Amino acid sequence: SYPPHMQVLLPALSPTMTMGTVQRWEKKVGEKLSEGDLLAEIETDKATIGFEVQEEGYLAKILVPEGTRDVPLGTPLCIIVEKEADISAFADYTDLK
Amino acid sequence: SYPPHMQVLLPALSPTMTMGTVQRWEKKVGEKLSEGDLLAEIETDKATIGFEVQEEGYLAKILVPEGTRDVPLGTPLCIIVEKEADISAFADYTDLK
Amino acid sequence: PKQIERYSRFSPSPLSIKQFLDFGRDNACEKTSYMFLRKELPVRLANTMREVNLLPDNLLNRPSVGLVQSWYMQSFLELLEYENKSPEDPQVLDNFLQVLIKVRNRHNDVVPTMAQGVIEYKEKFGFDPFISTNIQYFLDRFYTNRISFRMLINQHTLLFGGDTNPVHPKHIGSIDPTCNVADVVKDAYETAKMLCEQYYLVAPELEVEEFNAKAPDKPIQVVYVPSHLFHMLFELFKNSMRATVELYEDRKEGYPAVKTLVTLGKEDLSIKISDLGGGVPLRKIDRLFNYMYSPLFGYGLPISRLYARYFQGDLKLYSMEGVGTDAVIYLKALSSESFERLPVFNKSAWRHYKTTPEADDWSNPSSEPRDASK
Amino acid sequence: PKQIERYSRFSPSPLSIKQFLDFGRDNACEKTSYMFLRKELPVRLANTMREVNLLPDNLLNRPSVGLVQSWYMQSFLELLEYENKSPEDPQVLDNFLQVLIKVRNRHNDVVPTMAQGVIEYKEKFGFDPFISTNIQYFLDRFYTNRISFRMLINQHTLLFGGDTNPVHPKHIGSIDPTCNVADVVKDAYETAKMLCEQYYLVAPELEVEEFNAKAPDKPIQVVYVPSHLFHMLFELFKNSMRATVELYEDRKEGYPAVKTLVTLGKEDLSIKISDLGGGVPLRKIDRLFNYMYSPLFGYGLPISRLYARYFQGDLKLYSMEGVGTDAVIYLKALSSESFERLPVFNKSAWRHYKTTPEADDWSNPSSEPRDASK
Ligand SMILES: Nc1ncnc2c1ncn2[C@@H]1O[C@H](COP(=O)(O)OP(=O)(O)O)[C@@H](O)[C@H]1O
Ligand SMILES: Nc1ncnc2c1ncn2[C@@H]1O[C@H](COP(=O)(O)OP(=O)(O)O)[C@@H](O)[C@H]1O
Ligand SMILES: [K+]
Ligand SMILES: [K+]
Ligand SMILES: [K+]
Ligand SMILES: [K+]
Ligand SMILES: [Mg+2]
Ligand SMILES: [Mg+2]
Question: What family does the entry list (chains A, B)?
Answer without folding.
Answer: Belongs to the 2-oxoacid dehydrogenase family.
